[PDB]
Design a binder for this molecule. Structure first.
Ligand SMILES: [Br-]
Length: 293
């Protein structure tokens, strides 16, 4: 498990904010998108497997990784919709072309599925793991973290995230099978070392999860993109995790009904990149070679 980032950050000003990304290599774009509470760093041991298969791009969501913080920050900031406005504008600016393979996790999957559904002609394939693929109930959510996520989705969320940094310090390591090295953990901590609003994105994200019908706008979004994913003949790569976290049980059965789909299974809970990067990397490379072939 390599500890260094895959590339050095590059920056573009988007809508009044500097956003950070990795962009290495040439050819058709392979775009990796992290979710909460991670950054492009999550992909550092996976991207090498895609060398020579395209232009490898991994963006840091607004407020996350090396991307700027929104200001003034507060409970109305970093909604799905605002994260989308910033990321979609970044992807537009980067001139990704029209043969994009998306490699998606967590909220990166909601964003990337939405983007593909809105740019169907530009997407060649989607690989996804531990993704948001359908509206949920708490029974779908890992038992071990129900209480913590209900707390985030309440007024207790502010002290949990902004004061105590619980998403970074507890949720992240609790959903990795191995133990991160201190150096790896401190790469995850970096964007969030300051108590207070720097940690807002880690709180806004759980508040957007589509659970028991709320928030309704996100439930609506997921229902729209999932209807496309059911029907589309776009090639898919489903990277299932064991035991997994958010794609388990009935949700896993549901994903397995999608057409034109390759499956792999690798060990992991939620942050599967930190347990099985070689296997994930190999599988994405085989998928992309097939799509080029
Ligand atoms: Br979340």
């Amino acid at each position: 498990f390599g500890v260094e980032p895959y590339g050095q950050p590059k920056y573009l000003e988007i809508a009044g904010k500097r956003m950070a990304y990795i962009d290495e290599g040439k050819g058709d774009a392979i775009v990796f998108q992290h979710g909460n509470p991670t950054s492009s760093y999550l992909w550092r041991n996976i991207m090498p497997h895609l060398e020579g298969l395209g232009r490898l791009v991994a963006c840091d969501l607004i407020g996350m990784g090396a991307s700027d913080k929104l200001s003034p920050s507060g409970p109305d900031r970093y909604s799905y919709g605002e994260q989308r406005d910033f990321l979609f504008a970044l992807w537009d600016a980067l001139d990704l072309g029209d043969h994009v393979v998306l490699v998606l996790h967590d909220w990166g999957s909601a964003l990337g599925f939405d983007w593909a559904n809105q740019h169907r002609d530009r997407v060649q394939g989607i690989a996804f793991m531990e993704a948001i693929v359908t509206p949920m109930t708490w029974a779908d959510w890992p038992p071990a973290v129900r209480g913590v996520f209900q707390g985030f989705r309440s007024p207790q969320g502010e002290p949990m995230a902004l004061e105590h940094n619980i998403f970074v310090e507890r949720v992240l390591p609790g959903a990795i099978l191995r133990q991160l090295s201190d150096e790896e953990m401190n790469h995850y901590r970096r964007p969030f070392v300051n108590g207070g609003e720097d940690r807002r994105p880690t709180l806004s994200w759980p508040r957007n999860l589509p659970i028991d019908g709320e928030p309704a706008e996100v439930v609506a979004l997921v229902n729209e993109y999932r209807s496309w994913l059911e029907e589309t003949d776009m090639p898919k790569l489903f990277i299932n995790a064991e035991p997994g976290a958010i794609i388990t049980g009935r949700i896993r059965d549901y994903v397995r009904s999608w057409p034109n789909q390759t499956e792999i299974t690798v060990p992991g809970v939620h942050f599967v990149q930190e347990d099985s990067p070689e296997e994930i990397g190999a599988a994405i490379a085989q998928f992309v070679r097939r799509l080029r072939s």
